[PDB]
Structure 1
Amino acid sequence: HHWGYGKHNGPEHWHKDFPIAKGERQSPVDIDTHTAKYDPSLKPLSVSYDQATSLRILNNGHAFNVEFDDSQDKAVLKGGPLDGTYRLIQFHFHWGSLDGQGSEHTVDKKKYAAELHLVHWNTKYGDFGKAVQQPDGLAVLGIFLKVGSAKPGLQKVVDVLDSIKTKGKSADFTNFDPRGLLPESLDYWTYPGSLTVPPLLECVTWIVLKEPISVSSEQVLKFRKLNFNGEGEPEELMVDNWRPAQPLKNRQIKASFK
């Protein structure tokens, strides 16, 4: 009876195994654009992905991860609100059963069709497993997806999904360039938060880009053909693998713009 996204094991149940679910800096949150404060002391985000080494893509039974070699400074995030250098380890998405839902963060209560998370860890802590135990251990760059024109840089991901349909399947995924998933503007909101999945650790500096990327209806439909179940089990479509917005509590969301 492990955690997941269903009626019986979804986000409203998580607190029973992971009490930090009702903590003081949980994610995601609603971004109220009117009350976010412009902070002119925030710096531009530095996204240095030119040397990224993708390795593999994995269906983990909740979503899929695209994994990177993080054993050297190859793909790093710095600047913005961050001190020091954060190394890209993986990215993944959350998405809906319908185009009107799927994102974890919301913007003035607006849900997007999906949300991309590029997960990076603070190199001062040496490994990811050490970084997640620290209040400034992770930086996750979140990017909203809306349905419209196709995103050409997403298509290599969509095309490999049929090879990892079920839980525990993986496939080689080299030479993928995550720059193709970025929107044009790096304007962002930022706040202190958590992993949005168990173990819900409060170790994340969230950086959420204001500008969504557009993906096509055919692209997101392919996401919705994945399966939460393993091979040779009844089909449970992998959809609605998002956690709702959590109370902001004693936090301020800062804007890098306007």
Structure 2
Amino acid sequence: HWGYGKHNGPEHWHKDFPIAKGERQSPVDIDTHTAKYDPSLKPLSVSYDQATSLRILNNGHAFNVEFDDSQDKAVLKGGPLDGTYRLIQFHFHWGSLDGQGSEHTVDKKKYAAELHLVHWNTKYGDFGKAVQQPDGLAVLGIFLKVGSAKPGLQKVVDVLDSIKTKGKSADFTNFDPRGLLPESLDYWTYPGSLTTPPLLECVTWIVLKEPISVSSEQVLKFRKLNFNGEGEPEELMVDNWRPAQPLKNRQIKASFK
């Protein structure tokens, strides 16, 4: 099955998921000089006051912090979006070294990690229906740089020991995702895809310009997770990012001057 190694990583995915070579794949490099400010874009509305976290799961590729998405509790709207998109989960992609890990890049710069807050368009009723639609998902992407600690990330770092291996999960109620946001909601936006198989082309990407700072100890802790299951030889969960893909016939728009 697919993964991030030499033998089953991003260069191989197209054999089981041919859309890997499609017209709207993610991530991409954000060329800041080529992205045009779009004065018709709206501010983003991130409404997380009522977010209900439930569980954190090591799925063998990343860890997912999952939310109750059976009602409009934590939603994203505005920005480039029509309609209301419900938060279902967030996860990260990160590197074995602080110089690499993000999936999007900015003028070819890689950050140490990238947070993806995944939301689905409520007009489609559930997540599995939404991923069959070109406007089914909205993913808010936030870069992590290593510097000062991010206090709102520490409860996630604290629990990773309990979900070290593939298929482990733990209670993760009462987590406020507002503590993972940077100060500014200035963003770039473009149409793309999931960045892991099945690589579906359903995503409006909204990538914040301002990274959050995390400490070197926080990201070290991410790197102690395992891809493998319990009882299997240890494979550190690191470098679970897909490199930038061809932009093709797409424009990246900026919300800011």
TM tier, shorter chain?
over 0.9
- Alpha-carbon deviation of 1:194? 0.3
Find the residue that maps to 1:12 and give its secondary structure: coil
Match of 1:203 in 2: 202
Match of 1:105 in 2: 104
Match of 2:75 in 1: 76
Q: What CA deviation, in whole Å up to 9, does each residue of 1:122-167 have, x standing for no partner? A: 0000000000000000000000000000000000000000000000
Find the residue that maps to 2:123 and give its secondary structure: helix
TM-score by length of 2: 1.00
Aligned-partner Cα distance in 2 for 1:62–1:78: 28
- Alpha-carbon deviation of 1:228? 0.2
TM-score by length of 1: 1.00
- Alpha-carbon deviation of 1:195? 0.4
Q: What CA deviation, in whole Å up to 9, does each residue of 1:53-88 have, x standing for no partner? A: 000000000000000000000000000000000000
Q: What CA deviation, in whole Å up to 9, does each residue of 1:2-32 have, x standing for no partner? A: 0000000000000000000000000000000
Identity level (%)? 100
Q: What CA deviation, in whole Å up to 9, does each residue of 1:199-245 have, x standing for no partner? A: 00000000000000000000000000000000000000000000000
Aligned-partner Cα distance in 1 for 2:229–2:18: 28
- Over aligned residue pairs, what C-alpha RMSD do you find? 0.2
Aligned-partner Cα distance in 2 for 1:115–1:201: 19
- Alpha-carbon deviation of 1:38? 0.3
Find the residue that maps to 1:243 and give its secondary structure: coil
Aligned ranges 1:216-255 → 2 under 5 Å: 216-255=215-254
Aligned-partner Cα distance in 2 for 1:197–1:78: 24
Q: What CA deviation, in whole Å up to 9, does each residue of 1:175-195 have, x standing for no partner? A: 000000000000000000000
User: Runs of at least 4 residues of structure 1 off by over 6 A?
Assistant: none
Aligned-partner Cα distance in 2 for 1:253–1:154: 29
- Alpha-carbon deviation of 1:110? 0.1
- Structure 1: any 5+ residue segments left out of the alignment? none
Aligned-partner Cα distance in 1 for 2:3–2:44: 33
Find the residue that maps to 1:218 and give its secondary structure: helix
Match of 2:6 in 1: 7
- Alpha-carbon deviation of 1:44? 0.3
